Amino acid sequence: SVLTMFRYAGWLDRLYMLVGTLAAIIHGVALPLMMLIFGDMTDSFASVGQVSKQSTQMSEADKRAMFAKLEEEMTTYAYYYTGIGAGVLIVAYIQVSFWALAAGRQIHKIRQKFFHAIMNQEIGWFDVHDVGELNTRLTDDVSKINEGIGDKIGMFFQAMATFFGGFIIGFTRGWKLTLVILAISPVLGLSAGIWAKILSSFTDKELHAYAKAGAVAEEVLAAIRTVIAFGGQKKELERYNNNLEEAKRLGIKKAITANISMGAAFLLIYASYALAFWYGTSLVISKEYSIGQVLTVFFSVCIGAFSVGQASPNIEAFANARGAAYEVFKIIDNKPSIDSFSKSGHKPDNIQGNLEFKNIHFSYPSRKEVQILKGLNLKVKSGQTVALVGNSGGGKSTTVQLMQRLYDPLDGMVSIDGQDIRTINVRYLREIIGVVSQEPVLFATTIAENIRYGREDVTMDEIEKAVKEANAYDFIMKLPHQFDTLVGERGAQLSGGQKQRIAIARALVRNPKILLLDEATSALDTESEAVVQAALDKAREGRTTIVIAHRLSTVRNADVIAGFDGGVIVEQGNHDELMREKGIYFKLVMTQDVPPASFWRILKLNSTEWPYFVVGIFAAIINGGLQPAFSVIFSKVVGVFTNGGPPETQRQNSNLFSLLFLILGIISFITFFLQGFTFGKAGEILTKRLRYMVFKSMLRQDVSWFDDPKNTTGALTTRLANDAAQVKGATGSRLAVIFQNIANLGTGIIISLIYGWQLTLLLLAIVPIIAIAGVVEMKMLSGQALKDKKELEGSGKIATEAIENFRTVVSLTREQKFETMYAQSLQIPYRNAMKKAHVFGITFSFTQAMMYFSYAAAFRFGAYLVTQQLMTFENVLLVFSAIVFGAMAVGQVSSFAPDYAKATVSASHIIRIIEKTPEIDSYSTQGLKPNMLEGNVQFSGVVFNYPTRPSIPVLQGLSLEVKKGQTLALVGSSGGGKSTVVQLLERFYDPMAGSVFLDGKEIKQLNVQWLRAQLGIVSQEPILFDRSIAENIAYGDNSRVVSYEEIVRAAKEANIHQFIDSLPDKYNTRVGDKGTQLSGGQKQRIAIARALVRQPHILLLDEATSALDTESEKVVQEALDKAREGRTVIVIAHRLSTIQNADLIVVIQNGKVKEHGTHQQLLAQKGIYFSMVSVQA
Ligand SMILES: C[C@@H]1NC(=O)c2csc(n2)[C@H](CSSc2ccc([N+](=O)[O-])cc2[N+](=O)[O-])NC(=O)c2csc(n2)[C@H](C)NC(=O)c2csc1n2
Ligand SMILES: CC(C)CCC[C@@H](C)[C@H]1CC[C@H]2[C@@H]3CC=C4C[C@@H](OC(=O)CCC(=O)O)CC[C@]4(C)[C@H]3CC[C@]12C
Ligand SMILES: *SC[C@@H]1NC(=O)c2csc(n2)[C@H](C)NC(=O)c2csc(n2)[C@H](C)NC(=O)c2csc1n2
Ligand SMILES: Nc1ncnc2c1ncn2[C@@H]1O[C@H](COP(=O)(O)OP(=O)(O)OP(=O)(O)O)[C@@H](O)[C@H]1O
Ligand SMILES: Nc1ncnc2c1ncn2[C@@H]1O[C@H](COP(=O)(O)OP(=O)(O)OP(=O)(O)O)[C@@H](O)[C@H]1O
Ligand SMILES: [Mg+2]
Ligand SMILES: [Mg+2]
């Protein structure tokens, strides 16, 4: 809402804000009293000024007293200054640190509950929303609330206290001159709100545009193997670039609006000065006003009004937090109906394996016009095995998902032991259910930890027993690191069968009563399949299994078989009973380190934008070379009264100074707008160019660079979003002050030295000390950024693993574990944020108290100068206004130093990732491009070891040949290396020892993009994108635009056209993230269509029909056979039906070919192929 921004504050934060607000008010009130004392001394110091009147008359003691009296009241005046300076050092720390301790203690609680609410949402919520932007919301939108409820709110109450203090002081010391300077106060107040609203809207738009870019980057980098295989680097780069421009335009517009609002602020400052020193004729007329009185009233009113105006960014930052705190709170406010964390619900003590589906009707939320199940009836008895068979897309996986209460059926009864599963506790219901999905998903951790995700309180002996059951013990014992070997993200650094066998054990450790297997033996060979089936059969009596498979070897021994035909059970009987039924089952039976100059090299990427960095530089010099000139005119307008005598001389004649003030006000636009525009625009051209180059370099890297444990998808997205954000934070306004403040101090160094040079010496003592504040910050917070950058990548890893793998987490009920892992990773940034808060408070207090101390020091020391008749008020005031505010400007220069350090740390990594050169450079056009390709594939003694496990040999001199028009079928056991050679023909990796030959030329000489162009690859786990059906098929050829007719032809060849045509929205249907809104067979068929639309010369199929049923497999194989000639096909399969008709079949186990020949030749001789053949039937 509008006040619910602070709901998790608690008593500790409510007292931090209250005492922080009181201290902010006290700190704001200090300036009005500062103007009181300044005006009082100005009037009381000018009483000895114009001592030139009757200067010749000298009682001497009268002059001696005039002076001695001067230093007598000036001594009291310096004491009040020092008292205010001492008192501000206490309330400014309370003002800044307490507010940051209320933001830190709430943003940390906000994040832990935002994560808890994302983890609490239903599966349908993840299905209907684009959850890829959720990590960006967590990382950057909560950081927007952090900047809007921090110390900036504390500096807002300081502005209000300064405005009210200005009211009080002006009214006490002035009746008329106040309302004169209050004319522009409503104008500034309305500009505050208007420009704050505009900037908040633009902030929301830019945040949405960055979220889109982050979602695009996460989608591309999570399927980088498919992007590289199909050569989609250019198209994904352009997709990222579109969002980069849609945010850049909004960035340049933001910059111009921000630098023109502030320019109007300068214009109003100068107009107020001119209109206040006009009506300064009240000084000419006696006793109407005093010179000190005019200065004190004008300064009090001006500081109040322009602190309200200067708080507009603080209101804008509050308005920015308002702009992005809604989704962060909308998601928390949303309460799912299927609440896993809810404690309410029955938890039966004794449960029998009785499952009932009565009149089940279900439709997925994302596609609610399609009835997946229309009256589903199913009965499962205790200690029984039921096998669900049917065509692809029937709703078997839908039945498995409904069994876990992932979705609520639209109308029907899903019950266990005759009890509503809606009444049963959701978490308890899921605990007694061990599920292996169609395509098992692992996490980016060790094998042992992935197995522990089943039951977190599991012993090692139980894990070993489970892997023994799942036939995984041997291969885990084989590799180094044993159970501590890290698998890749989503199980990438594992074989398909190995990954499937790790997830079977993960469900077995749970000791489930309900075992939901969804094609858990698809990737296993016939030997591992028998072992797993025997292990399941040994413990059959304990639990009831809902088993789903297209292979007919697992379903032959099931107690009962249920057949699906359009969402209904058409057949329900045993194997013998359904053998004579002559139904769908019968037909199925017949069918079968940081450099210090990093930030300068980043700024060297704007060499094309040099005209913005020279005219802007000159404008910054002018705008910083005239701030000390403002002090000169200010000193003159003070001195026309302090050292001015007769009213006829000067006074009314000295109205040229107001004209000078207005001329400088026009110059305020003329130079500030240019300096903030050319820096606010080149600061958006650079961050866009930085992100573009970083993303282009990321897509350039090898497949080996994405296998590193440091380079995960979440880590990559964090590294892409944060580095450029930090560099942008340094660039821009924080870049302008360096070219201005150094001038601001510098020019003063000259001019203050020509009027009074004794006083200027304090500068050689004030800019040291303020500077040595920044170092004791930078030194004492030096390395924290490095521990705040690497850990930030860590937390985004837990979120990305949790968000993108939400279905697996929910099925395992591991949401609480991921919350714990996220909080643990958040602890270190939390502590570094409450340690940075106190340090920043101390630094701000010191830098602000040195202003007040310098008031006393400078004026008191200038009093001695006046005593020795060496300086007057004009000189001391001019040199003070120059040097003290120059010191305060270099104070800001030293204070923003942490931003420079963070940018340098980010800049080093940005330049490092840009300059990196891959070994297999995809973008390189240097390579031989054959005009004619004859489809000759040869592997001569290829030896390959994966970079992540270089000790392990994968292939030992593998030699094979396939000819144009010949079909080569790779077979063997899990982990043999069948997918490896497919990964070697794509040139994902370079073989260590051995050669790969295409058309008689070794493939390393050929252009890598050209080589990949003629390869149509279907992977073992085909991964789609979050795009339309016709856009995934049109991804097969990225060098041309694919016509709709070609897409339909490819779909027809892949036996998927009928499904899409019958589907609403037809080919425009948007499939879910990674294709999760399709069945496995449909996703495999769409991948087949994507490969076939390319019209490839070499067709590399890696279990391309694993999820397809018998009829679809037959259709796809017949379609391939119609195009048998004109292309070579290398196919890997585990079912001995596709492999039967291949021209040559080779057994690849342990990296060698052992059995070579055709189907009849290998079947006739007893051996490995006959070994698979015998147990298959
Ligand atoms: C550029 C420069 N100074 C400032 O910019 C400045 C920083 S502190 C401050 N001024 C205080 C109130 S505060 S001004 C301010 C300026 C900037 C920001 N900010 O964070 O954007 C905030 C504030 N603020 O605390 O409200 N003003 C004085 O002490 C004060 C008393 S006599 C005097 N100056 C001289 C004699 N008169 C001037 O006209 C004059 C000449 S050269 C100059 N000023
Ligand atoms: C300029 C000085 C003399 C003014 C007075 C200083 C105090 C207001 C400061 C100094 C030390 C501060 C404390 C230093 C450290 C902590 C721990 C810090 O703990 C956490 O990080 C959160 C966990 C929790 O609070 O349990 C909370 C603030 C607190 C109590 C600080 C509260 C404010 C204190 C008392
Ligand atoms: S009386 C209003 C008061 N401004 C000044 O005292 C003053 C004299 S000279 C000067 N400001 C120069 C020209 N301005 C800046 O250096 C500057 C940088 S940012 C900024 N002013 C913002 C727009 N102004 C304030 O924060 C502010 C509050 S009171 C005040 N100026
Ligand atoms: N998350 C989802 N959102 C929308 N529709 C979905 C989703 N998951 C599946 N579907 C659709 O539901 C239907 C049945 O899919 P389901 O996964 O239940 O089939 P299946 O029998 O398990 O298939 P397969 O044998 O190919 O694994 C299909 O039309 C599919 O597109
Ligand atoms: N990216 C990788 N990094 C490291 N090791 C890997 C990687 N991919 C596979 N391996 C390992 O290489 C070996 C062979 O895997 P590969 O994918 O070639 O097997 P496969 O014959 O295709 O398997 P399956 O029949 O189960 O699909 C296994 O030990 C596997 O763990
Ligand atoms: Mg399925
Ligand atoms: Mg494989």
Swiss-Prot record:
Reaction catalyzed: ATP + H2O + xenobioticSide 1 = ADP + phosphate + xenobioticSide 2; ATP + H2O + phospholipidSide 1 = ADP + phosphate + phospholipidSide 2; a 1,2-diacyl-sn-glycero-3-phosphoethanolamine(in) + ATP + H2O = a 1,2-diacyl-sn-glycero-3-phosphoethanolamine(out) + ADP + phosphate + H(+); a 1,2-diacyl-sn-glycero-3-phosphocholine(out) + ATP + H2O = a 1,2-diacyl-sn-glycero-3-phosphocholine(in) + ADP + phosphate + H(+)
GO BP term, pick one: ceramide translocation
Positions annotated with a glycan in the UniProt record: 50, 54, 57
SMART domains per record: AAA
UniProt domain ABC transporter: residue ranges: 355-591, 937-1175
Residues binding ATP 1: 390-397
Record localization: Cell membrane; Apical cell membrane; Cytoplasm
E.C. code: 7.6.2.2, 7.6.2.1
Mode of membrane association: Multi-pass membrane protein
Transmembrane segments: 11-33, 80-100, 150-171, 179-199, 258-279, 294-315, 614-634, 659-679, 735-755, 757-776, 837-859, 876-897
Keyword terms of this UniProt record: ATP-binding, Cell membrane, Cytoplasm, Glycoprotein, Membrane, Nucleotide-binding, Phosphoprotein, Repeat, Translocase, Transmembrane, Transmembrane helix, Transport
Regulation: Translocase activity is inhibited by verapamil and is sensitive to energy depletion. C1orf115 regulates drug efflux through modulation of ABCB1 localization and activity.
PANTHER family noted in UniProt: ATP-BINDING CASSETTE SUBFAMILY B MEMBER 1, ATP-DEPENDENT PERMEASE MDL1, MITOCHONDRIAL
UniProt record similarity statement: Belongs to the ABC transporter superfamily. ABCB family. Multidrug resistance exporter (TC 3.A.1.201) subfamily.
Note: In mouse the MDR gene family includes three or more related but distinct cellular genes.
Name this protein carries in UniProt: ATP-dependent translocase ABCB1
